[PDB]
Design a protein around this nucleic acid. Sequence first.
RNA 1: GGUGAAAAGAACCCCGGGAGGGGAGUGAAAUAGAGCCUGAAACCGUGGGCUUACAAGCAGUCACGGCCCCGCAAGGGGUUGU
RNA 2: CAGUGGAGGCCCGAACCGGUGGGGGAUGCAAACCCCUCGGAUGAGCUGGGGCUAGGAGUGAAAAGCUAACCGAGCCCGGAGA
RNA 3: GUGCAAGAGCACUCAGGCGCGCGGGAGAACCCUCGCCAAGGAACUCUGCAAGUUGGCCCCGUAACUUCGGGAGAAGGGGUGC
RNA 4: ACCGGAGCGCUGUCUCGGCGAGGGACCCGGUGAAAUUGAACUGGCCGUGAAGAUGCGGCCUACCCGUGGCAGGACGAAAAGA
RNA 5: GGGGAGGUUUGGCACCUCGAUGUCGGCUCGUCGCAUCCUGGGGCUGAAGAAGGUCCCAAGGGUUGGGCUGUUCGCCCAUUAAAGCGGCACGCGAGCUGGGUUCAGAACGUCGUGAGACAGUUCGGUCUCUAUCCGCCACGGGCGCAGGAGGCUUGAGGGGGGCUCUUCCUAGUACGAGAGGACCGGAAGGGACGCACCUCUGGUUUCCCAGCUGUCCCUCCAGGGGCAUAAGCUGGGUAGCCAUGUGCGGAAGGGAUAACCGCUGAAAGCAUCUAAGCGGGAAGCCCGCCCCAAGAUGAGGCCUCCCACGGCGUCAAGCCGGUAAGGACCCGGGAAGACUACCCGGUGGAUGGGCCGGGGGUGUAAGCGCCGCGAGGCGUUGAGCCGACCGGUCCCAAUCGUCCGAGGUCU
Lengths: 205, 122, 138, 59, 117
Amino acid sequence: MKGILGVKVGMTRIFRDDRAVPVTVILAGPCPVVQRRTPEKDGYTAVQLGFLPQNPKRVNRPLKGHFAKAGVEPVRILREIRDFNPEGDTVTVEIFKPGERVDVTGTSKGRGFAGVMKRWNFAGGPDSHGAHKIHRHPGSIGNRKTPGRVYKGKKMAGHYGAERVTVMNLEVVDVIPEENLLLVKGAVPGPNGGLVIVRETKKAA
Amino acid sequence: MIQPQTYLEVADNTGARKIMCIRVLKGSNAKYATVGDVIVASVKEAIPRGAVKEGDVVKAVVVRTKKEIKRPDGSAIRFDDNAAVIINNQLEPRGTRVFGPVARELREKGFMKIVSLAPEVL
Amino acid sequence: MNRGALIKLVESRYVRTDLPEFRPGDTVRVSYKVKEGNRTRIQDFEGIVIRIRRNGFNTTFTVRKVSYGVGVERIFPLHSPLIQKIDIVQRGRARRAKLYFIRNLSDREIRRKLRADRKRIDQDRAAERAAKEEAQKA
Amino acid sequence: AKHPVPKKKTSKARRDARRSHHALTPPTLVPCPECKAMKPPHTVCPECGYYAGRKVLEV
Amino acid sequence: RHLKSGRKLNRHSSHRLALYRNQAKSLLTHGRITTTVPKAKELRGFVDHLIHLAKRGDLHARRLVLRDLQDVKLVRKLFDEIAPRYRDRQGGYTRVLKLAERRRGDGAPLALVELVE
RNA sequence: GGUGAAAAGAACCCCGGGAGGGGAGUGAAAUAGAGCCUGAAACCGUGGGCUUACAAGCAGUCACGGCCCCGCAAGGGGUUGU
RNA sequence: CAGUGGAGGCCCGAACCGGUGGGGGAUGCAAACCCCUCGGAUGAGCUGGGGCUAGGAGUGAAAAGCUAACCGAGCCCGGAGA
RNA sequence: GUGCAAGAGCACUCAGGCGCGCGGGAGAACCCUCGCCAAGGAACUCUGCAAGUUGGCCCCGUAACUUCGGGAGAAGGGGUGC
RNA sequence: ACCGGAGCGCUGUCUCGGCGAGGGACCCGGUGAAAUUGAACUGGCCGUGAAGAUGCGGCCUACCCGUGGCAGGACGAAAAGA
RNA sequence: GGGGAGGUUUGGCACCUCGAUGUCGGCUCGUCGCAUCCUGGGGCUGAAGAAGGUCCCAAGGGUUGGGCUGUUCGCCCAUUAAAGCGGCACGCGAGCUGGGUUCAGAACGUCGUGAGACAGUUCGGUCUCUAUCCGCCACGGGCGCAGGAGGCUUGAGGGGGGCUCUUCCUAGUACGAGAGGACCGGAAGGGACGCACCUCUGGUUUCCCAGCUGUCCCUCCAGGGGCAUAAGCUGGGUAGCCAUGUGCGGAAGGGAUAACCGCUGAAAGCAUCUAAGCGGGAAGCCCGCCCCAAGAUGAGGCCUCCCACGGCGUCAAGCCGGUAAGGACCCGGGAAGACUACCCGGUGGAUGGGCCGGGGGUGUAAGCGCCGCGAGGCGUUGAGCCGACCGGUCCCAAUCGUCCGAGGUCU
C-alpha cells in the first residue's frame, strides 16, 4: 500500500490499445518525504509528503528545514501516507508502473447550497397541473403526530460542494518521469489543477 | 434512447410496416433500448395482403435509431429514424427482405441473420 | 508544470499530420473498420460530412452520407482508428460549418447549394507535378 | 397576519440575544503620507491624498 | 457553481451595455471621473480595451468604437489628441481609485477614473 | 383642565443650518422652563455589586456553601454554586 | 343564368362592452386586482344628462339575485336597560 | 409620419411627455415571469388544464348531410423577398 | 368560450430533468408594521396522565448565541363550530 | 370440536377535542414491523434430475412501465429473480393536487297534495405570500481546552453503502426409457442504484460570430446605432453548468453465529449434534470500504517555534501597557461562497484588468480594384472580430501603513 501526491491536469481519450481511453493526468512530480511516524511516539506508520517548491519569506519559522534534512517546504505544503515506509529520497511518480489500478483522494469542487433535486435527489413534480409553488421542492418530511419530529438526517436541502472524496479502482496506463505525469482512466474528482493524492488500490488485499 | 410509446417502422417483408414500442426484455427496470436491443411491439400499421396483421403483438430488434451510439473507439453512427426488425418468440427474423444500412453492433449481439443480407453494414 | 495545455501538447505523439485538408462541405472516400470475430477489415466510408469540432488533441468530424436505405451520420475521432480515411473532392463555399439544414431537406438542394472553389483544384493541378518539380529542385 | 404567528411572547433577554450577535462594528483608519491626517486604507483624502494627490482644493 | 466564470451585472443586458457606453463617453470627454467601485472596475476594463483600439487608426476600429459610442468630434479628439499620447502605452490607460465618505444616502464604495499620462 | 403669588415667561456669550443645548440671568423654588404642579406602573436605557460558556427548566422553595455591602457584638441584606 | 344592388338579433376583429380556461396575487397595487386566452362585436347593442318605481314594498331573460362593499327582508332612530 | 390586404390593429418613431419618491452590491437554495433542449412523443394527468403546432393576403381544393342559406378558412396543399 | 370517447399533427405534461434570464430572495446604508402573545429557563425515548408531554416519573442528547433554509409538532394562527 | 394471539377490516363504548382535531385517494418524502413477494440457507418430501409442494432462520437490499376507473381495491397489457402484506391521525393540504366529497344554481329519475326533501344520479363551483418556539440540514460569532504561534494528525462515536439478471466452459458428462436435463468451480456481457467527472456524445452561453425584417437616426451612398424582452428573429456556438454522456462503488477476505449440519461423550453398560469440549454453516451480526469527526469539557497525539520583572499582588491567584513566534485590519482576488467562513496573492508581485501570442468560436468582413442596366457577384480572403479560456507582459489597480498578540497556576 504505497502512494504519491499530485495535482490534476488532462482528461481526453487517447487511442491506446485500439480502443478509446478517457485520460486523466496527474503531476505527482517531486513530492517530498520529510518525516516518518513510528508506533510508540505516534500510533501507526505514516509519512509526510510535500509538493511544489516556491517558498521564501512568506513561510519561515519552524520550516522543518529543521526536521533532519531541510530541503525547504514546497508551497502546497504536505500530507500523509499511512502504512507506507519508503526508502528515503523525495518520491517522484514512477512509484506506480503502468498497468496497475489505484485509489485516489481529492477535494470535490464547490456547488454550495443547491436545490434538493440537484443535491441528494428528490423529484419535485407539478410543473403545470398542480401548482407553480412547489416546483423544485421536497414536499414532505416526517409523519403526522407520532413521531411528531423531524427524522435525524432525513435527507434535506443544503450544501453539496466544498467536500472531499476517495475514488477506487482507476487504471493507469502511462507515467512520464520526463516531466512527472500519470495517465489514468478518467474519473478525476475536483477541478483542473488542485489537490489530489494517489494511493494503491484495494481488491483482495 | 428507445422507450415504450414509441412508433417504429419495420424494414422488411414481414407483413407489416410500422410498429409501436412496448416494454423491453432487459432487467425489470431497463426502460431503455438501442442498437441490438430486444423489444416487444404492438403492430399498428401493416400491408393488407401480408402475414403479421394490423394490431399484432410480436417481438423485435433495433437496427437503426435517431440517437446514435458510441463505438468504444469513439466513433458513433446514426440512421435517421426508428427502424427495427420483427423477431419471434424464438429469437428469429421472421421475413427475409432486409432494407438499408444496419449496425454491426447487432453482429456481436447474436443477429447474424441481419448482418448477412444486410446491405451496408455499419 | 503550470501550462496544463503544454502537458496535453506533450501528449502529442498521437497526431495525424498526414491527411487531406477539407472544409465542412463535402469530403467523401474511405475510412477504416473492424468487422468479424478477429477484426481484419477497413470498410470504406465516403460521405458529405457536416461538422468540424476543433479541440487540438481530438478535433472530431461528423460525416453525413445517405445510402441504400436513407441518411446516416458517422462521426470520426480525427486521430487513430481511421487509418488513411482520404476524401474525394472536398468542396465548400459554405457559410456556417454546421450543416443541419441538410438533415431537413436532403435532395437536389444539396447540389443546388454547393460549388467547389475552383482555386482549390487549381492548387491541386499545381501541387500535382510541382511535386515532381519538387522531386527535382532542392 | 398569515400562517406563522408568534406562539407566545418573545422574552426581553432573547431580544438582547438576537441583538447580541447584532451590535455595531468599528471602522479603521490609516496615516497619510505627505500629509497630516487619517484615511480609510488604500484611499485618497481631500485633506491628504495618494501619490501626486489630485483635487485637494478644499477651502 | 454559479459565477464560476466572471462578469458583473445588475441592469438589463441592453441597459448595461448602454451604461458602459455612456461611461466611456462622459469619460473620454473629461478623464477624471467619480463613480461606484464595481462600475469603475468593469468600466476601466471596457474603456481600456476601446482606447487600445484607438491606439490604431484603421477606419475599421474607428467606426467600431464610434459604433459603440456617438459623437463624431469625439472620434476626432480620440484619434488626434487622446490615443496619440497613449501611443507608447500598452495597457490600463485609465486608473480608478477609491475615495472616502461612501455615496451618501445609502453608503457606497466610490472611486475615480483617470487619464493616466 | 391646572407655569408661578406675580411674566419676572430667559437679554448676552458659546457649539449648531436649525433643532436643541452649556453658563449667565429670573425668583422662595427652573428637580416650577412654557400643554410646564404633584410624576405609580408597564416601559426602554446607564453605571455599578453578585452569578453564568459539561448545561434538562411552573423557574422557586429549604438547607449548605462562597462573594460583596451593612452591623459595637450576636444579627442582618444583596447574590447564586450545590 | 348574368350583372346589378347591399339585406341581416350575419361572419373575422379595434375603440366599447363582458368575464370563459389557467397562471399570479391572498395583512395584495387592490374590501375582486393583473398577465395570458377568451365571447359579443348594426343590435335583445352600448354610452353621458335629466326623471321615477322601496322594506313585506319595489326591480327582477328568475338566483330569493339588486336596492348603497355583508339582503331569506336594507339603513337609521325610537319602545328598549325586549 | 413609415410599413403590412387595409385600418382608431401592430413594431419604430413625429410632436408632446415620462423614467413610475429608496437605492447599492453581490450574482445562493428557492420563488415570479421568460428562453433552448438531445433522443422518445401524451407514456403525465382526474383532464393534452397548461404550453406549444397552426398563423396574414392571392391561387388550387373540400365529405357526410342539409331546412339549399350552410356545413367551409372544412381538411389537404401552393406561393409570397429582391 | 357548456360534460364525455377517439384521431392526426404538435409540443418539456411526462421519462427527467440540465444550463440560462432578469426581478425578488441574500450583505452595506435610510424608513420600517402586522396577526399572536399566562410566564418561560421550550432537545429525545419508554411509559403514564381526562387517553396525543421539553413541563410527571423512570430514562435519554448535548458548550453560549445566532444567519440561511425545510416543514413533523407546539392538538400551530384566523372561526365564543356552518 | 377446543385454546391463543395480532389491532390491518368490520363493530360495542363515548373519555382529550363542538370559543374547531380539514374527512377520500394521488404527487412528493419516507421510516420502521416481519406472521418474507424476490434474492441466501437448511430440514422434510407422495424429491431421479429439472423444477415444484411445505416448514424453520434470515429485512441486507430490492419490490418495474402502461389501459380503464376520482377510485386505495381490483381486472387487464407488456414484462421481472420478484411485482410483499402493514403501522405511523388508515403517515404526510401552515408540502402540493382539489379530481372524489356532504354548501347555495340547475336538472335528472324520485318521494312528497305541496314548500322542499332522497348511502339515487349528473354539470358547474375562492387551500388564507413573511416560521416566534421545538425538530431536522447547511453556516458562522463568543468562550473553551488550567503557557503562548503554526503545521501534520489519532479515531471515540456515528453516518452512508451493502442489489442483481442472462450468456457461454466444465458436459449434454450424473441422473434419466426418453423428453428433459445438474451440482463444483470458472468466463463474459446486462439492468436498476450510489459516487464523482467535461475527455468523447449531446443541450446549454443575456451580445462570442453571422444572415434578416419594418424602422428611426448618425450622414445622401455605403456604412453604423438603438427599438422591437426584461437578446426584435433565426442559423450556430469556447469555457464554466450538465445527463443520455463518462470512469468508478457493491466487493474480494477476516471474526463470532442463527436455523440447521457434524465430531469425541456420559449421566442411563447401548444411543445422542451437548449438560464439559471442538468444526462446518447465511445477501444477515462485527470488521474490512467511503465520509464526517478531539465541544472524544476527557478538549487527546506528533513535527517543530518564541519566551521572564516591564508597573501595583513581597509571601496567595490576579491585574495593567507595549512586545517574541505570530495573528489580524484594508486590499487584488478564487472551478470557494446566501453573509460569514475556507483557499491564495499583495511590488522581493503575475492577484484582476489592459496588452501580445496561443487555442477556440464564428465563417472570406469594413474598405479597394473588377463584371451585369440591376439585385448582386469574382477576387483582395479562411479574412475580420473575438465572453469566461493555456500562458507570456508590472502597462494600471494590490500605496502607505494600522492594531491584537507569551512576561510562561499549582501539587
